RNA sequence: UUUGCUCCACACAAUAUAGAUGGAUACGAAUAAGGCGUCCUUGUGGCGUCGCUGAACCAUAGCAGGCUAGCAACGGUGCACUUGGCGGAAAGGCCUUGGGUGCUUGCUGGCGAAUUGCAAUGUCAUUUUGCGUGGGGAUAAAUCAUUUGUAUACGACUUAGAUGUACAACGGGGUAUUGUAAGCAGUAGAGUAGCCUUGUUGUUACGAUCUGCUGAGAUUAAGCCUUUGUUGUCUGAUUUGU
RNA sequence: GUGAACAGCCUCUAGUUGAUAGAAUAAUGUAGAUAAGGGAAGUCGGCAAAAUAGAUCCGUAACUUCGGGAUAAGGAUUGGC
RNA sequence: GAAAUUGUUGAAAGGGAAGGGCAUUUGAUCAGACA
């Protein structure tokens, strides 16, 4: 949701011409953030290994409220609300290995060149 | 540097000044030098 | 660090007010105080007292003198802690004229 | 650094104002030593 | 921002591949003329020779090529090294010296090979990347923000900022623009009043304007010039690796 | 108050200071303006714009249904004390 | 609690549209079938 938007500097940070300072989100996500780390305080979580794993939005039922245009006529002119939802998590390490053992399928004529290259070879 | 050399009389022609105009160009200038300022002037409340 | 200073400045509006439109001289020039005020002090904080609106708004509002005389007094910021824990207030000082006064420094007390 | 003017005879033979004094513009280029610190050298290649 | 980078070495692990499988084997010029050998007087020369296709040339035998002995040679060749030289068209390749070492199918021997079961590509090339190791080598910047205006709709561009010919804020001097500030004084002033001691400038004042101190006062970089003075500031943010 | 005036412009009383903001000041606009020398050559055409303007005084044509035409035209003067 | 349509995550492709047909490489995924 970009086109047609100013250029500014501030986004060489992100790679992008096209960025923006949104407040009143800022201020109702960060606003949501703060209700996770209550939460994470208060199911022991440490504090510090904190990342946001997960932070979808999508959209709220409208709202209708109308608009007059020109001869007599009514527009539209509706609030566009949101749904957002974020998730935090404590940061963790490692994953160790351990899958399968790939279970080897080889003709007879493939065994031979096997038992033979240790006959043979090292 | 030019990248010919130009017979154009209009070129060649050995250019000698007369007179460099040293007056301010911060206005309409009258005196080249402060000397020639204060010369004609006269002098001043702040001054000698 | 802080440091607690007073100090008694002029400033040139003139310069930074030519060009200007009318009907947003006086206020760009309450404005520019501000910004002067930050330039020296530091502090994003800046106050005016009600007097040295006046002193500003003294002639209409396209008409601020070309100069100032401004006491900016930095002080610490008190109670239910903002960000920066100082300010500045901006006083006008009773000069005659603000001509060809440089910048003094106020001992206090 | 900006122009000025100046004055100057005239030394076109044939014109109406040869051997004459004519005004002129002129710019004025600040030009202080400048100063070698490298060098280079190109080479003629079939792509240039 | 948790030991990060780079070049040399191996180790695992990935991932790829417009498509290895003995060798891209170097004059130039002519074509109703040339290649090569050879002789000479060194020429547009004498003599000879070749072509008629690279079907050539070189290489090619040994568990996908093992393990071994010996003779004859004094040759070849693979590798790491060392000497001297050449190559800028994209040089990144060529050549030459000298030791060391493996191989030699130049020739003669000893041993091995099955049972991959009558074929199943029967796996042997090189791609890029990533993770630890240890053998050298190296200790930056860019961006936001602030700032200049030689630039600009926004981005962009052009300057500046860790303590100095630093930068900003005032102040000073230059440079300009206007046309003589406020104040004070006067025997300037058409003139008007008021108290007499009714004038041998009678006095107190008042009067647009005028004159003096006064080319004075005001303004002057906001995209003017300059500065030994005055005062202040000089490490916030983020990003990047072959 | 100025002035012919319930005009315009400024003020007393009373009433407002309501009309999203902030930063910039590119092109192109809308609305407000000036421009050397020339002066309708522009354009269907003076479209637009500009010039005139109050008051006092001098001066005033053709034509006329004698009521006009007529502020015709053309001119001078205008503060302050 | 379908569709149009949207958010997140997972995979894949993209040198001036995208979608389709025959065929096959590649990856993912699945039935059946042996005895
Ligand atoms: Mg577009
Ligand atoms: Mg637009
Ligand atoms: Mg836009
Ligand atoms: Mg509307
Ligand atoms: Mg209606
Ligand atoms: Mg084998
Ligand atoms: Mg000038
Ligand atoms: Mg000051
Ligand atoms: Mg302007
Ligand atoms: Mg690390
Ligand atoms: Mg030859
Ligand atoms: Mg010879
Ligand atoms: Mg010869
Ligand atoms: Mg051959
Ligand atoms: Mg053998
Ligand atoms: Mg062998
Ligand atoms: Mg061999
Ligand atoms: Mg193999
Ligand atoms: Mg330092
Ligand atoms: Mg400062
Ligand atoms: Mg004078
Ligand atoms: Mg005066
Ligand atoms: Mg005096
Ligand atoms: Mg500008
Ligand atoms: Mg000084
Ligand atoms: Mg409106
Ligand atoms: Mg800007
Ligand atoms: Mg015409
Ligand atoms: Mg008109
Ligand atoms: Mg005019
Ligand atoms: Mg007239
Ligand atoms: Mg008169
Ligand atoms: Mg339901
Ligand atoms: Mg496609
Ligand atoms: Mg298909």
Known sequence: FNSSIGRTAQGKEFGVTKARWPAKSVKFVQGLLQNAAANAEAKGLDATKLYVSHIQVNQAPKQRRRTYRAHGRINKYESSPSHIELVVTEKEEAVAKAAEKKVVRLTSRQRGRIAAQKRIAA | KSLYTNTSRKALEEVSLKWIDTASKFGKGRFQTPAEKHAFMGTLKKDL | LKDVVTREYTINLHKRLHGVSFKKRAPRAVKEIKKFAKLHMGTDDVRLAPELNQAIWKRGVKGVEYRLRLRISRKRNEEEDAKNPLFSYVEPVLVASAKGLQTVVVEED | ?48
């Open chain 4, 1 to 48: 650094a900006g122009m000025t003017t100046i004055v100057r005879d005239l030394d076109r033979p044939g014109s109406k104002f040869h051997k004459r004094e004519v005004v002129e513009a002129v710019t004025v280029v600040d030009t202080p030593p400048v100063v070698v610190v490298g060098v280079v050298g190109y080479v003629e290649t079939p792509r240039g």
